[PDB]
Write a protein that binds this ligand. Sequence first.
Ligand SMILES: O=P(O)(O)O[C@H]1[C@@H](OP(=O)(O)O)[C@@H](OP(=O)(O)O)[C@@H](OP(=O)(O)O)[C@@H](OP(=O)(O)O)[C@H]1OP(=O)(O)O
Ligand SMILES: [Zn+2]
Ligand SMILES: [Zn+2]
Ligand SMILES: [Zn+2]
Lengths: 222, 34, 290, 167, 48, 143, 107, 299
Amino acid sequence: QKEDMPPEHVRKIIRDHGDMTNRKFRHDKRVYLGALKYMPHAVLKLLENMPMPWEQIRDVPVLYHITGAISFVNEIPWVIEPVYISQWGSMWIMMRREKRDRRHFKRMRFPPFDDEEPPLDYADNILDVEPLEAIQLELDPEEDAPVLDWFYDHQPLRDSRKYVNGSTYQRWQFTLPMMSTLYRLANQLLTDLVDDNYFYLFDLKAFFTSKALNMAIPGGPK
Amino acid sequence: QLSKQYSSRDLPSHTKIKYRQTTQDAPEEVRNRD
Amino acid sequence: WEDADFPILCQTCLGENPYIRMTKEKYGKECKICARPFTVFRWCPGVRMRFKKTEVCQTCSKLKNVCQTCLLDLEYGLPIQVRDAGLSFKDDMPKSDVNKEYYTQNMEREISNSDGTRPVGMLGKATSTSDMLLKLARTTPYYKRNRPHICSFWVKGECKRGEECPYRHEKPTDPDDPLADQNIKDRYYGINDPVADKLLKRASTMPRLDPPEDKTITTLYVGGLGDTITETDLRNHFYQFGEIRTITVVQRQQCAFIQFATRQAAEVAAEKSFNKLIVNGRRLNVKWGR
Amino acid sequence: NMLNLLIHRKNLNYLHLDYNFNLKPVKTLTTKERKKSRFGNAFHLCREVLRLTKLVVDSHVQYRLGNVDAFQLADGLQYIFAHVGQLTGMYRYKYKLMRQIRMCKDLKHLIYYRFNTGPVGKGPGCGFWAAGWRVWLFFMRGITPLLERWLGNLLARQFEGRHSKGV
Amino acid sequence: RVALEKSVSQKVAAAMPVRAADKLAPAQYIRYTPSQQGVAFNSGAKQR
Amino acid sequence: MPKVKRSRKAPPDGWELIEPTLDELDQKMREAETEPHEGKRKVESLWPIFRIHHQKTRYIFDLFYKRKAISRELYEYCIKEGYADKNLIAKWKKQGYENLCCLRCIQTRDTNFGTNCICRVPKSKLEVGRIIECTHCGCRGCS
Amino acid sequence: PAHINDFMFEQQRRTFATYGYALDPSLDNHQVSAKYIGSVEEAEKNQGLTVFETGQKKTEKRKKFKENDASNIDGFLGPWAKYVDEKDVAKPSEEEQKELDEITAKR
Amino acid sequence: PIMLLSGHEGEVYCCKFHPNGSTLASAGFDRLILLWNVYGDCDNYATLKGHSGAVMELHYNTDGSMLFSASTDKTVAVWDSETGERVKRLKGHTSFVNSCYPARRGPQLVCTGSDDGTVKLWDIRKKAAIQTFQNTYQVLAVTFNDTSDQIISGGIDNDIKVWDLRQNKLTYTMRGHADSVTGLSLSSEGSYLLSNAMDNTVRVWDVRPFAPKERCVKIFQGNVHNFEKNLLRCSWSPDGSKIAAGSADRFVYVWDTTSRRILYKLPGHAGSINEVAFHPDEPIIISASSDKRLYMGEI
RNA sequence: CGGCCUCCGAACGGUAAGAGCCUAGCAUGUAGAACUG
Ligand SMILES: O=P(O)(O)O[C@H]1[C@@H](OP(=O)(O)O)[C@@H](OP(=O)(O)O)[C@@H](OP(=O)(O)O)[C@@H](OP(=O)(O)O)[C@H]1OP(=O)(O)O
Ligand SMILES: [Zn+2]
Ligand SMILES: [Zn+2]
Ligand SMILES: [Zn+2]
């Protein structure tokens, strides 16, 4: 099969070419150009796998052109639903308690760089530096035992065929201890409703009838 | 010499032909009629 | 653009091994003749010998009936200027940009009505391949063609890749030689090919039978007969080529002498026979006798 | 690199695209250059989408270079996504964006006016950027076929030529 | 109908231009009978 | 300054004796990486990278398999931290592929006719001894 | 459009390449015999062995090195190990070098 | 008509008719067996599955009910044409099984030639080997004798061999083949055996209570070999009248026993013909060729 | 027991058209290459 490579391979090609001015390359000129038609794919791919603020470094499969012209992050970011909700709920509590207990929050400046301050080299500048503690929240070892080690992992139970269908990361099965702890943790971003007799005249079908009759519910759309 | 230019209007659309059914007026009933 | 079955090139350009390997790319590049996209088939010429590629539109080829890689004619294999002149051929192919594009377009239209067997036009009504062309024609595959260039590194010293110099690391030719810079387009147009002028000088200095002075010298001495010949065989060499008046088969000197009944018939037989009238294998010399 | 190759292949030496993806002329341009150097919604929509992603990447670069913070990074990302209107200037090339921009204001209002339910203050310390992230990602789902078609046609017309023959 | 539809679908795939390309078909094996015959070229074989 | 370690879990306990070898190989990979793009060539400037990679993963291949001087769990940590090459190794384990230079040297799709590099044909079948330079690695008859 | 198999064509090509003679392939309606074409007497004296089929050759294998320890910091030529009877720098004759400088002047 | 058949992933190696001539069997590299209707429009219904290597020989029974098939993957296999599903996996064969031959109208048994160096007898019922004659080399062709008391074999020594099923030693060896033995076929006389060989010369013998002890009777010219060395297979007519052969020239060879003339050298093909099947009732021929198709000629 | 809260901006249409002129670029990277009694 087609097999992976050392990262330094591509890194070398790309820092080699730089900005295609050197008369050495001189043909990847036109191939580079022709690669423009897909630049909106590269961007959607890159931006839909961004690192989700509790992690400091996320690594992703990357497909790329043998002259460095383009680089598609070749990955679809699956997450487990209650996992995800619980993590973002942790984020919610952390952000609120923090901005409450912080003396003055500073707003960073955009653009973060200057206009002719060229983009920095990853390896030569950012490869080795220390990645700066993230937005981890501290879960209680008795209260939150059934998760305590695997919570903030990029893909938490990626490798345990007791929990995940495989290395494709689908079809999860979970324990009720796990579930009740998670529920308690994502308690903040959640609805304290038990049934649907709340949404009596406030559901999709009521809205469809309204829309059709040009009438408007007090608190509904028009 | 077939170009790669293209058009918003030549995108695929209406890709099935509605055939004239039995009740509307098929060429069969036209075969019959007086 | 065009679409092909396989290339058209001589044996020299074509190869030696029984199994040839060539890769195809549809609409690969531009025939410097038809100016438009063509198909490109790339053939592995020989062991460590430069991979060649198809270098002209197949219609640009069927036009003049030459080699789409080797560039020389496919019947004889001499410069196209030569081969044309050896048929006395005079093609009116247009040259200017708009004129040439119009010509190419109607040419492809007219060639579309062909069956893919033989070049179009005067290429058949000039098919009297003259012994001049036959004699200027090369005999064996001059397979020096698939040797690489002069590895400019290896000409200055630099070719530090070991033996893998991409080019023959020999002494570069002094471009003062007229056999050096022949622009491919000119070589195709039959436009001042110095190699073709060399073939003209060679086929001009190459031996042919000489004419005598007075018309009444109608005796023709054929030198180098041998005693396997008959008078009727000398006749059947020079008999329906006109009429013969007499023949003296000199066995004390191994020659012959045809007194003719038509001077132009004598000329036909003898001049066509110069050193090449090979009946039963003996090199006779056709001249006009004393 | 792609966009610069496009300019300089079109032989527009008097324009230069800088590193935040602003296009800036280095001379005063005559008419013939003012005209030859005009660009359309394809070129400019890529330019501005690239500018959005570059702002995102570079907030992340600031964080990993170590200047800022996890909290400052999250709040900055929240900013970027809510205020795409006044950072990029994409609306001028696809004014159907204001669908999205109104959606991100409505989210901002919801999130903030539930976020400061208690002592929490109404100031910068709020980065909860799931929502606007979703929004602009769906926008991208939609825009990629459109931009692929427009840019294929731009490039085709650039390399073959425009067919004024059989219009 | 047949010949029509084939030429249709080629001209239609022209309006694909993003060809979701199919891969390269099986390799061609062709027997070539040169018109040039002679013991010296092709090193003495009458076909390639 | 090293390949900064992600797992946050402590490396198992044979790491300390491959330690300086791994560190040095990383340092000279860095140096041969920034080694700038001379009048050298463009096809040939991507050989040293595979040289250093194959170098390192061969080192670990010995130190787990041919010596058994290392623990399974250590060597697992040292692949998952990107020093070794799990696929290169799972092929190296084959019968004819002990010295396969670069895992691209057997990619059948990487070549127009559907073969491998002549870098893979054993030299006895060649009999011509002409120096063989597989463009990708530059390598010299890995097999 | 003849149809053939390939593995035998590849064996034939390996032979025709490295031994220099080939099983003549002409499929004439005149029933020829299996004949060695190319370096005829070479195939005859070699008993026809193809570059793939094992057979004994006392041909000197070109002089090679062998450093197979990947523990060496600057060591492993490994799969890339140079042949030891090869030169260091492929420098072409001083003569052609001076003549090449002169010609670069001449143009 | 012409009636060229297709649908095969690769070259067609083995083809024969129903011993009725009702449905048709063809197969080759593709590791499955295609079956057809011979008549009508030459329709293609069913495909047997399973055989791991190229199915090196299909062999009917003589009534037309059971199907034996020797595949290169170390195994012979029995199948029910009624179904298409395997009745036995005759394993134990240590290497490439080329040939299989089920005894006609005798008790249930097969003699199998292979790439091991043995000739093997096996029973359909026991999953057990009955005998094995190791001469020394791989066995390429096997045909019984019409008493089912001798086994005929063609291998790599050009020396056509026959074993006594009861005395178990080399009963008949006859020689005169210029090179390796590639195809054996017992005529409907029960007596004459037909043998092809790449050496351009094909031979007939007669295995009787008495034959002249040098029984090379009739010889035919034209068969070709090339650098391919593909398998070569031949047959008699159902009437023992026309000699049917294929070869690597793309010419199907049709001779007669009587005047041994060339009755036909038929072109049409693109691939080397790897098997010719004569129809048990009709003047119908199916030419299985390496051009990944078939022909059905009417003569 | 009452709840009802549109919008939002960019381009073309204005600051001539030209032939010459001259020189970077930008493209090419090829094809071929000699003869006798
Ligand atoms: O135009 P916008 O991009 O959306 O942002 C601003 C601002 O936002 P930031 O805090 O994000 O810089 C405040 O919004 P809130 O923070 O209050 O939600 C503000 O609100 P006030 O000035 O009323 O404090 C204002 O609102 P408006 O422009 O209607 O006066 C408006 O936010 P919105 O535009 O989202 O309203
Ligand atoms: Zn290689
Ligand atoms: Zn390699
Ligand atoms: Zn190698």
